């Protein structure tokens, strides 16, 4: 669960940027660590004091992030036939 506030820098998004603080653990299984991060409104959803929201997949499906080493480029790839065809 999340503790989020509306951002305050400009008006072009004014909203949509939620300064979400939260508890978490860390390396030392015995340790904790609640930090804050800024998220776009499309990656989260609220749940029904200040409003609290988690994530829309957290009742449907698991979540992975991309390992940052790979690219995302569509590559020009020729598609060849097995011979005899």
């Amino acid at each position: 669960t999340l503790q989020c506030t509306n951002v305050t820098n400009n008006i072009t998004d004014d909203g949509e940027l939620k300064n979400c603080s939260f508890n978490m653990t860390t390396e030392l299984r015995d340790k904790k660590q609640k930090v804050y991060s800024l998220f776009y409104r499309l990656d989260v959803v609220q749940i029904n004091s200040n409003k609290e929201y988690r994530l829309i997949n957290c009742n449907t499906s698991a979540i992975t992030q991309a390992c940052p080493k790979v690219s995302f480029e569509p590559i020009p790839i020729h598609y060849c036939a097995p011979a005899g065809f």
Epitope: Q3, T5, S21, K32, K34, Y36, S49, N50
Partner: antibody
Framework: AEQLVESGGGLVPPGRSLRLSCSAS????????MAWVRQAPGQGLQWVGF??????????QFAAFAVGKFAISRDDGRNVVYLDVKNPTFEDTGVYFC????????????????????????WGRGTTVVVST | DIHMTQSPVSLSASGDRVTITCRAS??????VNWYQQKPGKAPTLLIF???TLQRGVPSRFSAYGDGTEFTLSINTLQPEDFASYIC?????????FGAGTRVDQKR
């Protein structure tokens, strides 16, 4: 630098509700939770209520007399805390201190316990409100 | 409520050694912030958490305790130390303060 400016009125007629203003400066203000301590003149300190930081919920509790009689509201867009004294009484004549909360040497509050243990480092000037006509 | 009865009520000394004992009604093991308000002025934390020196407060002060009955001591007195010294708990809401000690000079 890191200073707190209390204002909001002097002579107020009783019943006519009151707005205060704990104007801050000098630091990143939603790092710290906020509280109100009043003091009747010639008396000891009389804590009114606190309000947590938003990462701690932004939750605001009070003292026993301050249940219903008062209402805290902070504004990080201005770095100011408004205190609402609805139906002021002549009992509520006193100097009104406002202070912040102090993080540790690791810049944190307490994990277990109440959470707030490192006191109120910067004290404001205090505003003086007399509830009389 | 957990009440602080701070002892003494007033104090008189002259470079003397001052000792102030503030007790409780419950077990507050180390959760007391020791304050200083000079008259007509703001408060000033002296010993946070009943034993540890606040940065900016000189080393002539010393607080400690037991769990219920805490004790501040001063070695030694300075002529600007004649102020009101207040114990205050940090164990439980609501915030309760101490009696204070308006200190004058023994004469």
């Amino acid at each position: 630098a890191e200073q707190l400016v209390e204002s909001g009125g002097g002579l107020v007629p009783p019943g006519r509700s009151l707005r205060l203003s704990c104007s801050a400066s000098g630091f990143y203000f939603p790092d710290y939770a906020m509280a109100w301590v009043r003091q009747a003149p010639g008396q000891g300190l009389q804590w009114v209520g606190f309000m947590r930081g938003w990462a701690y919920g932004g939750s605001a509790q009070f003292a026993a007399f301050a249940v219903g009689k008062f209402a805290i509201s902070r504004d990080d867009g201005r770095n100011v805390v408004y205190l609402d004294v609805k139906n002021p009484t002549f009992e509520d004549t006193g100097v009104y201190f406002c202070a912040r909360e102090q993080r540790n040497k690791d810049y944190r509050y307490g994990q277990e316990g109440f959470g707030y243990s490192y006191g109120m480092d910067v004290w404001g000037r205090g505003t003086t409100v007399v509830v009389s006509t | 409520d957990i009440h602080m009865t701070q002892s003494p009520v007033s104090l008189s000394a002259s470079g003397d050694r001052v000792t102030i004992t503030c007790r409780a009604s419950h077990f507050i093991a180390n959760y007391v912030n020791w304050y200083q308000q000079k008259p007509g002025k703001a408060p000033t934390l002296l010993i946070f958490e009943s034993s540890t020196l606040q940065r900016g407060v000189p080393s002539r002060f010393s607080a400690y305790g037991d769990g219920t009955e805490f004790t501040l001591s001063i070695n030694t007195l300075q002529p600007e130390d004649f102020a009101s010294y207040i114990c205050q708990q940090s164990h439980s809401p609501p915030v309760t303060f101490g009696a204070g000690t308006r200190v004058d000079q023994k004469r």
